[PDB]
Amino acid sequence: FQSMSVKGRIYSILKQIGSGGSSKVFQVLNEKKQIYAIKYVNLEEADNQTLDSYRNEIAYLNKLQQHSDKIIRLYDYEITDQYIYMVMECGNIDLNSWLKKKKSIDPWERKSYWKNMLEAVHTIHQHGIVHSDLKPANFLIVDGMLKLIDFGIANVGTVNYMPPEAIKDMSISPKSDVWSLGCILYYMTYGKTPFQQIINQISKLHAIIDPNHEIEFPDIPEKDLQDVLKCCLKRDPKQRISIPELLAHPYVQIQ
Ligand SMILES: CN1CCN(c2ccc(C(=O)Nc3cc(-c4ccncc4)c[nH]c3=O)cc2)CC1
Q: Could you tell me in which tissues this protein is expressed?
């Protein structure tokens, strides 16, 4: 219940949405009582690699504004040696909170949300970005439309959406994002994530890598949706469907 100034404009704090490590997200109001969301980043103890992660994200978020309206709007930012203030658009709820709350999920709504996600992820891919950590939390609902809020660039954690090739990478391509998007859609379809059954985290990782671990796809009145899920959840990235291929899929094109 204080106020902040961003590029000579005063914003009164309505409420705090999020709290990260060195960051805070607020629902704020301008002089004309218009709502915005302000991301505040305290830089006081951030390292060179951390500052560069924050600078890269702001540059990408600022460039990608113009390429899609499925990417969160960034009106303005203030960047000093001490802080970051990002003036952005306000959404009603994130997809994770929305999915946890929603008992039933309408096929028309699911399909529209899938399309929204494919467009956002496709845009970041066209600019050489692979998010690599997609989960419902990265999507905000803003006037019935899902928007991507994060690019995976800046640095509870859920191993439930991790691609099999990301686990193998110990001794990551656009296909990695296809696996994660497929998990979100599997959740929106069957009410759960593919490897949510495995309560233990150690064995959950073995399951994603195990080719003989059959993922269940119970029959749906939407057979097109069933193929999307079977194509996204292919353990071999080489055999996994691509985003340009998903945009031409009958599930997205045929109503
Ligand atoms: C019961 N429900 C009520 C609704 N509720 C939420 C949860 C999250 C957000 C949110 O993150 N909002 C925003 C987040 C961001 C953002 C955050 C991080 N990086 C970039 C942009 C930008 N604009 C926003 O409006 C807004 C509302 C959860 C509990």
A: Present in rapidly proliferating cell lines.
Mutate to test the pocket of ligand 1, among 14, 19, 25, 28 (most ligand atoms within 8 A of CB): 25
Experimental method: X-ray
Whether residue 150 has its Cβ less than 6 Å from ligand 1: yes
What domains appear along the chain, each with residue ranges and CATH number? 4-92 (3.30.200.20), 93-255 (1.10.510.10)
Q: Which residue has the tokens 């899609």?
A: 68
For residues 44 and 82, give the distance between their C-alpha atoms in angstroms, rounded to a whole number: 5
CA dihedral 209, 236, 230, 111 (to 10 degrees): 100
Q: Which atom of ligand 1 is nearest to the CA of 37?
A: 23
Q: Which residue has the tokens 């998903």?
A: 246
- Alpha carbons 163 and 84: distance in angstroms, whole number: 32
> Residue 227 catalytic?
no
